[PDB]
Amino acid sequence: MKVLFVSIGNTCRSPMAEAILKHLVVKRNLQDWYVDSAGLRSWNVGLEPQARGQQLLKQHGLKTNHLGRMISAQDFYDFDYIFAMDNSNLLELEHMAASLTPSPTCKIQLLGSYIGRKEDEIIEDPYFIQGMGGFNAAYLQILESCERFLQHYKSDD
Numbered sequence: 612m613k614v615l616f617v618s619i620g621n622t623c624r625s626p627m628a629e630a631i632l633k634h635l636v637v638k639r640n641l642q643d644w645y646v647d648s649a650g651l652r653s654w655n656v657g658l659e660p661q662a663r664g665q666q667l668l669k670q671h672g673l674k675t676n677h678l679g680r681m682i683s684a685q686d687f688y689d690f691d692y693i694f695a696m697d698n699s700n701l702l703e704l705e706h707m708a709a710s711l712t713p714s715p716t717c718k719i720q721l722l723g724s725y726i727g728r729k730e731d732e733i734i735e736d737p738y739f740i741q742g743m744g745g746f747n748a749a750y751l752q753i754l755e756s757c758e759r760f761l762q763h764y765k766s767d768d
C-alpha cells in the first residue's frame with residue numbers, strides 16, 4: 612500500500628526505485644498503492660533526480676518529477692515499507708526509527724534482500740561512478756528487487 616525508498620542522496624537510486632515500482636503497479640493494475648522516496652542528507656535536496664538517471668529511465672519508458680527531500684519523522688508512521696539501498700542507509704534508518712518515542716510499525720528493510728543472492732544484496736550509490744555502468748547495475752538490481760517483492764506481498768505465503 613505505502614512504500615518509501617531511501618538512498619543517501621535521494622537523487623539516484625531511490626528516485627529510480629520510486630518510478631520503477633510506480634510503473635509495475637500500473638502494469639499490474641494494483642490498488643491502493645502509494646510510492647515515494649526520500650534521502651538522508653541535504654546534499655541534493657530540492658533538486659530533480661540526477662540527469663543521467665532520468666535518461667536511463669526515459670530509455671525504459673519511465674520518467675520522474677521528483678524533488679530530492681529529507682526523510683522526516685512523519686515518514687516512519689505513514690509507510691508500510693521503507694527500503695534502504697545500503698547497510699549504511701539501513702543502520703541510519705534503524706537508529707532514526709528507534710529515536711521516535713511512539714515506536715513506528717513501518718518495516719525497514721534492505722531492498723536488495725529480495726534479490727535472493729546475498730552477493731547481490733547491496734545496491735551501490737552510482738552518483739560518483741563515471742559513466743553509466745553504476746546506474747545500469749542499480750537499475751537491474753532495483754528492478755529484480757521490486758519484482759520479487761511484489762511477488763511476495765501478493766502471495767498467500
Ligand SMILES: [Cl-]
Ligand atoms: Cl515494460
